[PDB]
Amino acid sequence: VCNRLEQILVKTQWAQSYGEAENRAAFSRDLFSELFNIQGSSRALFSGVGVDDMNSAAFTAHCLRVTGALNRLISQLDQQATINADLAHLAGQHASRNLDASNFAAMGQAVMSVVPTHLDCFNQHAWGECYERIASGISG
Amino acid sequence: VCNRLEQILVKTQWAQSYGEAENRAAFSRDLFSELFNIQGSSRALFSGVGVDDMNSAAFTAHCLRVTGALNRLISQLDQQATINADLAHLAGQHASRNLDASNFAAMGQAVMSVVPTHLDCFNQHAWGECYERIASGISG
Amino acid sequence: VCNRLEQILVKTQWAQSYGEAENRAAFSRDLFSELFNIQGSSRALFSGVGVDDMNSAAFTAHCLRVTGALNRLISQLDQQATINADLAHLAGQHASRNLDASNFAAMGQAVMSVVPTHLDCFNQHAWGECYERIASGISG
Amino acid sequence: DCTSLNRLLVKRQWAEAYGEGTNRELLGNRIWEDLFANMPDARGLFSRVNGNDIDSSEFQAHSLRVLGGLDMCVASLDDVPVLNALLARLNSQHDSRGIPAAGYPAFVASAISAVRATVGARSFDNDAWNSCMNQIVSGISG
Amino acid sequence: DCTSLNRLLVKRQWAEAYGEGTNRELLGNRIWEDLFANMPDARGLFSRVNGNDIDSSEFQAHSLRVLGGLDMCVASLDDVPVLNALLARLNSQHDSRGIPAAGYPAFVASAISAVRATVGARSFDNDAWNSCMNQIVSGISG
Amino acid sequence: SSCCSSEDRANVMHNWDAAWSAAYSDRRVALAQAVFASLFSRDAAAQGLFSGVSADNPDSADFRAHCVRVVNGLDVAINMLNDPAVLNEQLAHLSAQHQARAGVAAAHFDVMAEAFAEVMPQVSSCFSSDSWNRCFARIANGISAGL
Amino acid sequence: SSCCSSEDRANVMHNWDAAWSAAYSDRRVALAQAVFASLFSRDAAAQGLFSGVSADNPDSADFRAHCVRVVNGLDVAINMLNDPAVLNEQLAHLSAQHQARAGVAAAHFDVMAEAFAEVMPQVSSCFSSDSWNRCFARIANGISAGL
Amino acid sequence: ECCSRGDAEVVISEWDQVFNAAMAGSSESAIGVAIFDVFFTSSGVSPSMFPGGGDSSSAEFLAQVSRVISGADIAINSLTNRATCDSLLSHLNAQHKAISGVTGAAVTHLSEAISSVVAQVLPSAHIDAWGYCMAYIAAGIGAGL
Amino acid sequence: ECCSRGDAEVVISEWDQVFNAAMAGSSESAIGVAIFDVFFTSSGVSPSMFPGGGDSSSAEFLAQVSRVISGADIAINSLTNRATCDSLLSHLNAQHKAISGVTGAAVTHLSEAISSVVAQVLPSAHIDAWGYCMAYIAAGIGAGL
Amino acid sequence: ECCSRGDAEVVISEWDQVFNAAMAGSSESAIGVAIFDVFFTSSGVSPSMFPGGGDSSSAEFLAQVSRVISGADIAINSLTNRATCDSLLSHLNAQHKAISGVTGAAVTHLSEAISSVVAQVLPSAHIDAWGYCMAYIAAGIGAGL
Ligand code: HEM
Ligand code: HEM
Ligand code: HEM
Ligand code: HEM
Ligand code: HEM
Ligand code: HEM
Ligand code: HEM
Ligand code: HEM
Ligand code: HEM
Ligand code: HEM
Ligand SMILES: [Ca+2]
Ligand SMILES: [Ca+2]
Ligand SMILES: [Ca+2]
């Protein structure tokens, strides 16, 4: 899942969307905005990071950590042993939060709702495969 | 599938992407460009409409008929009996072509690769539901 | 001192300089910048309002109070009994600070160094008269 | 007759004229200046919403209520059962207020005149607007 | 009542509407077209300044005189002793001209209407303008 | 206390105007119907307050017109957020109309707020939930004031 | 003969409008009072012409209103310098009003001109004395014509 | 020329004015039924040959009406590129050649029904440009019929 | 947020509209007296505690009124920089802590008196933005009172 | 101020110059290992406390290196908004407080290792702006350590 060619499209289009964004904080906030809009039950999971005000420093910080996590993972997609280690680390940071598969499918739809709106070219399937690669590493 | 609220997002975002496109011919061509890029076996199905030159009048015409079909269907999404009749008509125009489910999933990915690149707001799930509504009506 | 006609020029040119300034905080800071540049001994009088960082909120605040004081006085220049009362109030807020006449002459030169640089028309003498009116009310 | 095609034109031009935010207040202003100029005795009916000062907050809110009532009806012109139910409530909201029957044709003229001035005379169709406005006031007046 | 706060608003909006040079003539034009449309018998009072041709030099100078008279009063609204002395002279300048008392409330309405059209209805306060204009014409009419 | 700010109002008006069908009532009926379904699901008793407009038959003309009225009421108020002096008059009006309705209480507006917060994300592109919750409060508090 | 030119008129109107208090009479009283003080100092007899408005008490309402009228008269005329056809009517009007005043002679307008030429440099920023003297002549000659 | 580039651009502009952001996607059905009503009168063609028998209450006809408006939208929006437009017209021509009883005159009657209904809903419409560009469309769809 | 950047910019804009080039420097006194009149009614505070005893004919009070409007002008014009604004509010807070009988509620009553008088003289005023930004000012001036 | 807006913008600009469209997503690992090499020397900290024991051949450490560069990228790219940056620093501060043997000095040593490696790969780097903005980051991450 997420083969060597699919990684190229995802890395490129991540760069042209996230890596060229004027306001990385807004971009990261839009992503969690969608996720909440897609799955309102997800929002309460973030009571620890000041979700109540999505423009708080505390919540903007969380959003930046996650898109930062997304960025460091997409860059190591070709380094299978490095990312597996990094994914297992992320899995341990999510295990206590009792997440389910609907949470990860919602995050993926958020991811793929936000990313193409900052592009001229989008490969849906390549992105679905490689989001699954990450979510599957994080969900366990 | 494709409930009354999901229809609103799809109709709006179809309008802001397809309905605001500078060059409806290019937009329609990009869609079949992706489909072919996503599933190279699909291309030979269009030997009747001059697929060999994707910039031919014959092939641009086909692309316009299909995005026109997409447009007339999305506008009648709320008129259940009208669209069912229209979908059954489209199904009869595709039945002889021995299409399979991979063809319709590829078309959907093409649809959802092209459409968001002309938007600032995209609801992935709403679009998946309502593309399924159309494809399921056409595939039979 | 500061007759009825001199008040008109001062009120107008205060408006076209201070009242049209893009950044009233910068304008007020420039004024105390000059004063310090003109009389370095004056600076230590402001140790209570964070003079050590002239861009501090504490010191910008002081600068705004003073140019605000200047503004409310220039507007009441024609209302002799009101401004005398207001000047006597300001005199009481400065009496404990053991200021001397060189301090007030330095402030005046600061005032008349800063104000004309934001104007096309300046009447030196009218301004000297009416600054003397204020300083004399404040110094006692 | 407020025909299928009449309704389409009235819908499209109403949407363009009504617009957004404070610009709705512009439309409303044309109406009441014209109405109270032609029928200045009607102004007294609006004493509770300060009809003597149409630029006040009280009358501006009333003005915007009317425009919204009108917007409901234009939006429902294709759905007569819903249209009738909206006019029935509008009818309750106007009865036993001593409103002279001449106030309605006069309001229609002021409203059509304001819309014409917003969208442009050359684009305009008085027959379609009169037919559909009459179907609306016929449900209210009484 | 032309209150302290009324006077402030009338002062500020008058200053914005009155303006400079030929643009004062624009204001004056709105007034007399409206006044002579509503009360066309008043036009004969202005025979000496060519009231039949409001675009002439004679009437335009008169129009600009009135606006200046009005500007004196608005400027003096905070100084009643000076205000009264200005209205007294204005009163001499209008007596024994056969001016019907209805010409004044009508002039006030035309003037307020012109000002409203210059500064914008949404910014406007009819109560404050009517109260202060009445204090002015009460000193002139008689 | 968190305020419906100038920027909050622009987001709401943008989300609203962009999901709005300017010329046709089908869409605003669909929005209100999902809202009431949500509202009645959270508070099965609330439905009894709407007997006068045939709430037990959500697909009837009688109820679909109540739908148009509520949505219209909201559209007018939302569009007045840039003229809050005017907005205040309009909410005081909505307030009195809801005081005349036996059973309606401020608690119902909290459920109504939850119903819109659930439905708008499904009709509105790029929906700002924070701006909506704060300006919906601004509007709804004005209607529920006094009851 | 030197003419109040198009450029002369722009300078005057600029100096005037920039020293003008649009909303308050205090300033235009102060301008007129310094003007009359100057005028009466140059011609102690002139003051007797203003007995009808209490010239012997310059701080009285009665005289302060005469101040507003003269300044207003000038402001109207100055503002008509771009429509001189209109300006001519207005000066012919001012002319007649001053013919009805026993004692007023063209010589008084020269003293009046000196009084403004002394006072304006003290209220007006960047004051163009040449443009003023020529357009004040243009205006004052029209009022004093015939007397 | 007959339906020049400037003619086409006006027709596309006004067609889009009719189907603006407010009216697009809700008014096609009422437009198309009005067009057919106008067409049945002027052509004398039988509604029975159409799906649902011309019954504007019949879902079969409403969808038939939906296709016709769409095909018109498509042909019209392609007026600026005549090579692409000729191909779309030829496809429509082939589809109607497979249909018993479609005549060149009936095709002209339907194209003109579109102009006249557009003018009814858009009074400013440039009825000459529409006349020129609908006759070009009608000649392509009804060629050899 | 409560009194956002957009809220502040509107309040500053409208405050400046009230004190435009015509009205600045001549209307502060009539404004401030009107504000105090509104304030004495809503607060029930005694004019006797003020210099000149609230006597709008008293030069001592007119100057007191002049300071209050100025301090408001200063605080308002600093709304765009909240760090600077908090310091100005704290200075005013310290000055009123030195004064017997200044309560948090009376401070709110005075801040609201400013909004309402501004709305009376500027009917288009955005009374919500004023409400938000005057309550932020009133909380700073009346903190711990 | 220390790490002003202009300082921050330069650091972000040069950090982005290092990670331009060519180098982003392929050079993070070689950068981070170089940073750690510099850091182990200057700090004297044991590689054994790190995942994979500092072994640049160990996938566990390469991922650890990947997190550290990312967290730096995130903190740096947030330098223009200090409220957001302080929160990110506090999260990192809490994460390292949970770790036995992280000292304030070692944190300074790691922040400085980032500047020096950036200067090695970007000779034009403004080493003063980096010094100021990395010390602000190091004080946030190593607060109370
Ligand atoms: C699949 C992609 C995801 C990535 C890359 C990701 C990344 C992260 C990161 C970097 C953190 C911060 C860890 C730290 O440094 O403390 C975090 C925390 C968290 N994540 Fe995710 N995450 C993902 C998916 C999800 C999903 C699907 C949900 C739930 C719908 C979720 C819920 C949370 C929660 C609840 C926290 C803890 C917030 C707190 O500290 O209170 N994450 N995530
Ligand atoms: C689900 C969305 C689809 C829509 C709205 C659609 C629409 C259309 C339309 C309008 C036509 C022209 C009919 C006519 O007027 O003659 C057509 C033809 C055709 N479609 Fe589709 N189609 C869809 C999906 C697909 C898929 C998934 C494939 C294959 C991968 C496909 C293959 C074809 C072929 C082979 C033709 C015939 C071309 C010819 O005339 O030689 N379509 N389609
Ligand atoms: C003549 C024009 C002046 C004006 C209008 C003026 C105005 C003011 C104002 C408004 C305050 C703040 C009072 C408060 O609200 O607490 C103040 C404080 C002060 N002024 Fe002035 N001032 C003037 C001249 C001077 C001069 C000439 C100096 C010294 C060179 C000076 C030194 C001070 C000091 C030391 C303070 C106290 C700062 C503190 O709180 O620690 N002022 N002035
Ligand atoms: C298409 C025509 C009209 C529409 C859509 C309309 C709409 C409305 C609406 C929505 C209200 C608010 C009802 C409420 O909440 O109490 C209202 C109130 C009212 N309307 Fe109309 N109206 C129309 C014609 C007229 C005419 C012609 C008159 C009189 C000449 C009139 C006089 C009134 C009065 C007196 C009220 C009550 C005012 C108050 O609240 O004190 N309306 N109208
Ligand atoms: C605020 C209200 C008014 C103001 C400020 C005003 C102002 C003036 C002024 C300054 C003059 C010039 C006096 C002179 O130098 O002879 C004048 C003349 C005159 N005004 Fe008025 N006026 C007002 C209302 C009216 C009204 C309501 C009427 C009649 C409907 C009227 C009729 C006249 C007439 C007949 C003259 C004399 C015309 C002439 O010179 O032949 N005025 N007015
Ligand atoms: C922002 C929130 C709301 C808005 C904009 C709104 C708007 C309206 C409007 C315009 C009407 C018609 C008034 C009339 O014609 O007399 C109405 C009626 C009514 N409303 Fe609301 N409303 C809101 C919230 C609520 C809530 C939360 C409840 C109760 C749960 C409620 C209960 C009712 C009832 C019982 C009626 C009368 C029903 C009938 O006409 O038979 N409203 N509302
Ligand atoms: C540009 C120069 C002048 C202007 C614009 C001007 C303007 C005016 C105006 C508007 C009036 C009121 C007319 C009325 O209500 O009847 C007036 C009155 C009068 N003017 Fe002038 N004037 C000028 C020069 C002079 C000079 C130089 C003198 C004599 C030295 C003079 C003597 C008088 C007198 C005696 C009156 C009547 C006083 C009264 O009302 O009791 N004027 N002037
Ligand atoms: C401007 C002229 C016309 C246009 C734009 C037009 C357009 C269309 C379109 C787009 C279709 C759908 C084709 C398909 O997907 O199978 C169609 C079908 C059809 N048209 Fe036309 N048409 C025109 C004139 C006519 C006329 C004049 C007649 C009758 C005399 C006619 C009779 C039919 C019939 C019977 C069908 C087939 C219904 C079916 O079997 O499903 N058309 N037309
Ligand atoms: C928005 C609220 C307020 C503002 C902006 C404000 C502003 C001011 C300012 C600028 C001063 C002058 C300080 C100095 O230079 O010494 C002052 C003084 C004073 N204020 Fe306030 N104030 C507010 C509320 C209040 C309230 C509510 C009270 C009474 C309950 C009050 C009572 C006083 C008194 C008695 C003084 C001192 C007069 C003196 O001793 O010279 N203020 N205020
Ligand atoms: C500028 C200074 C530093 C930055 C930016 C930084 C950044 C990070 C980041 C982003 C993580 C991952 C946190 C997580 O997701 O769990 C981390 C973990 C860690 N850091 Fe640092 N760090 C810094 C300094 C230091 C220093 C000086 C030491 C040692 C003395 C250190 C030791 C560790 C260790 C041992 C872990 C945890 C590995 C694990 O248990 O998974 N860090 N650091
Ligand atoms: Ca985009
Ligand atoms: Ca794009
Ligand atoms: Ca300069």
Residue numbers in the entry:
A (entry chain A), B (entry chain A), C (entry chain A): 1 to 140
D (entry chain B), E (entry chain B): 1 to 142
F (entry chain C), G (entry chain C): 1 to 147
H (entry chain D), I (entry chain D), J (entry chain D): 1 to 145
List sentences quoted exactly from the publication behind this structure.
To overcome the above problems without any artificial modifications to the protein or prosthetic groups, intermediate crystals of the giant Hb were prepared from fully oxygenated crystals by a soaking method. The oxygen saturation of each subunit was determined by occupancy refinement of the bound oxygen based on ambient temperature factors.
Finally, we obtained four crystals with 69%, 58%, 21% and 13% oxygen saturation, designated Crystals 1, 2, 3 and 4, respectively. Crystals 1 and 2 were prepared by the pre-soaking procedure, whereas Crystals 3 and 4 were prepared by the pre-processing procedure. The average occupancies determined by the B-factor analysis (68%, 51%, 19% and 7.5%) turned out to be slightly lower than the oxygen saturation determined by microspectroscopic analysis for all four crystals. Besides the structural transitions around the heme pockets, the largest ternary-structural changes between the oxy and deoxy form in each subunit are observed in the AB loop region. In Crystal 1, the conformation of the AB loop of the A2 subunit matches that of the deoxy form, whereas the AB loops of the remaining three subunits shows the conformation of the oxy form [Fig. 3(c)].
